[PDB]
Design a protein around this motif. Structure first.
Motif, PDB file in Angstrom:
ATOM      1  N   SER A  44     -58.966  35.806  18.184  1.00  0.00           N
ATOM      2  CA  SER A  44     -59.186  34.533  18.797  1.00  0.00           C
ATOM      3  C   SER A  44     -59.475  33.444  17.837  1.00  0.00           C
ATOM      4  O   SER A  44     -59.912  33.759  16.532  1.00  0.00           O
ATOM      5  N   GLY A  45     -59.562  32.278  17.932  1.00  0.00           N
ATOM      6  CA  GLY A  45     -59.703  31.161  16.898  1.00  0.00           C
ATOM      7  C   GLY A  45     -58.684  30.964  15.928  1.00  0.00           C
ATOM      8  O   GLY A  45     -59.210  30.892  14.820  1.00  0.00           O
ATOM      9  N   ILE A  46     -57.494  31.359  16.256  1.00  0.00           N
ATOM     10  CA  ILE A  46     -56.245  31.132  15.063  1.00  0.00           C
ATOM     11  C   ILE A  46     -55.616  29.601  14.955  1.00  0.00           C
ATOM     12  O   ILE A  46     -55.605  28.699  16.024  1.00  0.00           O
ATOM     13  N   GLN A  47     -55.786  29.295  13.850  1.00  0.00           N
ATOM     14  CA  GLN A  47     -55.230  27.727  13.489  1.00  0.00           C
ATOM     15  C   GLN A  47     -53.747  28.110  12.997  1.00  0.00           C
ATOM     16  O   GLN A  47     -53.748  29.118  11.948  1.00  0.00           O
ATOM     17  N   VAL A  48     -52.628  27.891  13.271  1.00  0.00           N
ATOM     18  CA  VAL A  48     -51.375  27.866  12.802  1.00  0.00           C
ATOM     19  C   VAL A  48     -51.123  26.874  11.748  1.00  0.00           C
ATOM     20  O   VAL A  48     -51.409  25.636  11.889  1.00  0.00           O
ATOM     21  N   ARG A  49     -50.710  27.434  10.381  1.00  0.00           N
ATOM     22  CA  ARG A  49     -50.561  26.328   9.457  1.00  0.00           C
ATOM     23  C   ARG A  49     -49.240  26.554   9.137  1.00  0.00           C
ATOM     24  O   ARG A  49     -48.609  27.489   8.576  1.00  0.00           O
ATOM     25  N   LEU A  50     -48.553  25.469   9.253  1.00  0.00           N
ATOM     26  CA  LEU A  50     -46.926  25.206   9.009  1.00  0.00           C
ATOM     27  C   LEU A  50     -46.683  24.239   8.088  1.00  0.00           C
ATOM     28  O   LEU A  50     -47.745  23.541   7.416  1.00  0.00           O
ATOM     29  N   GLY A  51     -45.579  24.521   7.129  1.00  0.00           N
ATOM     30  CA  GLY A  51     -45.095  23.603   6.188  1.00  0.00           C
ATOM     31  C   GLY A  51     -45.975  24.040   4.930  1.00  0.00           C
ATOM     32  O   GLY A  51     -45.917  23.173   3.949  1.00  0.00           O
ATOM     33  N   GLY A  60     -48.995  18.169   0.912  1.00  0.00           N
ATOM     34  CA  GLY A  60     -48.007  17.187   1.528  1.00  0.00           C
ATOM     35  C   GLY A  60     -47.250  17.371   2.632  1.00  0.00           C
ATOM     36  O   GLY A  60     -47.025  16.402   3.370  1.00  0.00           O
ATOM     37  N   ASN A  61     -46.854  18.639   2.893  1.00  0.00           N
ATOM     38  CA  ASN A  61     -46.047  18.831   4.068  1.00  0.00           C
ATOM     39  C   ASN A  61     -46.444  19.784   5.302  1.00  0.00           C
ATOM     40  O   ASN A  61     -45.872  20.270   6.014  1.00  0.00           O
ATOM     41  N   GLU A  62     -47.926  19.973   5.204  1.00  0.00           N
ATOM     42  CA  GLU A  62     -48.469  20.813   6.184  1.00  0.00           C
ATOM     43  C   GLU A  62     -48.758  20.235   7.534  1.00  0.00           C
ATOM     44  O   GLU A  62     -48.953  19.035   7.500  1.00  0.00           O
ATOM     45  N   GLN A  63     -48.739  21.256   8.652  1.00  0.00           N
ATOM     46  CA  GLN A  63     -49.132  20.486   9.839  1.00  0.00           C
ATOM     47  C   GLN A  63     -50.118  21.782  10.322  1.00  0.00           C
ATOM     48  O   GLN A  63     -49.783  23.060  10.172  1.00  0.00           O
ATOM     49  N   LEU A  96     -40.978  18.957  14.154  1.00  0.00           N
ATOM     50  CA  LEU A  96     -39.824  19.503  13.308  1.00  0.00           C
ATOM     51  C   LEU A  96     -39.119  18.597  12.415  1.00  0.00           C
ATOM     52  O   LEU A  96     -38.602  17.477  12.576  1.00  0.00           O
ATOM     53  N   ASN A  97     -38.954  19.168  11.213  1.00  0.00           N
ATOM     54  CA  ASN A  97     -38.262  18.418  10.032  1.00  0.00           C
ATOM     55  C   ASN A  97     -37.597  19.436   9.105  1.00  0.00           C
ATOM     56  O   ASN A  97     -37.733  20.500   9.435  1.00  0.00           O
ATOM     57  N   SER A  98     -37.332  18.956   8.069  1.00  0.00           N
ATOM     58  CA  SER A  98     -36.565  19.993   7.099  1.00  0.00           C
ATOM     59  C   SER A  98     -37.458  21.003   6.365  1.00  0.00           C
ATOM     60  O   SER A  98     -36.924  22.243   6.128  1.00  0.00           O
ATOM     61  N   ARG A  99     -38.525  20.726   6.358  1.00  0.00           N
ATOM     62  CA  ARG A  99     -39.638  21.748   6.001  1.00  0.00           C
ATOM     63  C   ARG A  99     -40.577  22.786   6.930  1.00  0.00           C
ATOM     64  O   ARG A  99     -40.931  23.312   6.551  1.00  0.00           O
ATOM     65  N   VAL A 100     -40.528  21.931   7.976  1.00  0.00           N
ATOM     66  CA  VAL A 100     -41.072  22.772   9.419  1.00  0.00           C
ATOM     67  C   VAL A 100     -39.795  23.044  10.424  1.00  0.00           C
ATOM     68  O   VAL A 100     -39.648  21.899  11.064  1.00  0.00           O
ATOM     69  N   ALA A 101     -39.472  24.026  10.457  1.00  0.00           N
ATOM     70  CA  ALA A 101     -38.263  24.428  11.322  1.00  0.00           C
ATOM     71  C   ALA A 101     -38.391  25.705  12.001  1.00  0.00           C
ATOM     72  O   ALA A 101     -38.815  26.582  11.399  1.00  0.00           O
ATOM     73  N   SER A 102     -37.740  25.694  13.433  1.00  0.00           N
ATOM     74  CA  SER A 102     -37.750  27.038  13.932  1.00  0.00           C
ATOM     75  C   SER A 102     -36.611  27.965  13.404  1.00  0.00           C
ATOM     76  O   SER A 102     -35.378  27.496  12.536  1.00  0.00           O
ATOM     77  N   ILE A 103     -36.671  29.203  13.570  1.00  0.00           N
ATOM     78  CA  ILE A 103     -35.694  30.080  13.242  1.00  0.00           C
ATOM     79  C   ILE A 103     -35.068  30.752  14.779  1.00  0.00           C
ATOM     80  O   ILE A 103     -35.943  30.972  15.453  1.00  0.00           O
ATOM     81  N   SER A 104     -33.763  30.969  14.540  1.00  0.00           N
ATOM     82  CA  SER A 104     -33.162  31.478  15.818  1.00  0.00           C
ATOM     83  C   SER A 104     -33.396  32.796  16.076  1.00  0.00           C
ATOM     84  O   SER A 104     -33.633  33.603  15.058  1.00  0.00           O
ATOM     85  N   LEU A 105     -33.583  33.163  17.500  1.00  0.00           N
ATOM     86  CA  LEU A 105     -33.904  34.579  17.962  1.00  0.00           C
ATOM     87  C   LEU A 105     -32.272  35.310  17.848  1.00  0.00           C
ATOM     88  O   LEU A 105     -31.367  34.623  17.794  1.00  0.00           O
ATOM     89  N   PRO A 106     -32.434  36.589  17.801  1.00  0.00           N
ATOM     90  CA  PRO A 106     -31.094  36.982  17.487  1.00  0.00           C
ATOM     91  C   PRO A 106     -30.496  37.212  18.974  1.00  0.00           C
ATOM     92  O   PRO A 106     -31.193  37.152  20.062  1.00  0.00           O
TER      93      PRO A 106
END
Ligand SMILES: [Ca+2]
Length: 223
Positions: A44-51, A60-63, A96-106
């Motif tokens: 519990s208590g997870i913070q997701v760090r993107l970028g 400078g590119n974190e979310q 979403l931007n060039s440095r924070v982007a989703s990856i496709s599922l198979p």
């Protein structure tokens, strides 16, 4: 990651770091609100760090976005690690931007021999310990199910696959758990487990994502 290379800042845009006061597992962004990780990374208590590149320096590119809900697979077994997958929803949508982007599922499962990219901030030593600050990468092939089962008697289920090098020296490791195995632009695996790290005849074992696409899609559609 043992025996890999420095990825380069934000070159793996779907890679996330799960943080609970410190980095503890990887994950993969699959849309603006959801992350795929390993069920054994649940807490519990997870913070997701993107970028992220250096997880100890704000570059400078974190979310940073707190998780609002976690969903461990309904059939996850923590003793065998069968169905080692979970979904984490973000309290707010990532930008979403060039440095924070989703990856496709198979759309179909991958085959033995296909080369994939495995990444994370886990231990870089096969003996001893050293945790990197920047993201590490490893290109590795999926191994045949027969060689996987032979390497780990009585432990490989149809929801797991092996990837790596039987000679040893190149593998994922502690701290990489929950992270991505991407092949030809599709998220085919999740770092799950292995005997030590980078050990001869003990390749990395990964959750077989293609078996979970229907569950992932229906779960997202109703949560
Ligand atoms: Ca950072």
């Amino acid at each position: 990651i043992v025996g890999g290379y420095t990825c380069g800042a934000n070159t793996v845009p779907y890679q996330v770091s799960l943080n609970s006061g410190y980095h503890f597992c990887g994950g993969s962004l699959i849309n603006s609100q959801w992350v795929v990780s390993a069920a054994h990374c649940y807490k519990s208590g997870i913070q997701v760090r993107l970028g992220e590149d250096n997880i100890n320096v704000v570059e400078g590119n974190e979310q940073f976005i707190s998780a609002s809900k976690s969903i461990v697979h309904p059939s996850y077994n923590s003793n065998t690690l069968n169905n080692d997958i979970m979904l984490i929803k973000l309290k707010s949508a990532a930008s979403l931007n060039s440095r924070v982007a989703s990856i496709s599922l198979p759309t179909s499962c991958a085959s033995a021999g296909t080369q994939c990219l495995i990444s994370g901030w886990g231990n870089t030593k096969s003996s001893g310990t050293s945790y990197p600050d920047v993201l590490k990468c490893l290109k590795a092939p999926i191994l045949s199910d027969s060689s996987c089962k032979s390497a780990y008697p009585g432990q490989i289920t149809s929801n797991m696959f092996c990837a790596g090098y039987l000679e040893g020296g190149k593998d994922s490791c502690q701290g990489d758990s929950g992270g991505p195995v991407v092949c030809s632009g599709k998220l085919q695996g999740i770092v799950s487990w292995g005997s030590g790290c980078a050990q001869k005849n003990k390749p990395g074992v990964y959750t077989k994502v293609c078996n979970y696409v229907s569950w992932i899609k229906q779960t997202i559609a109703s949560n």
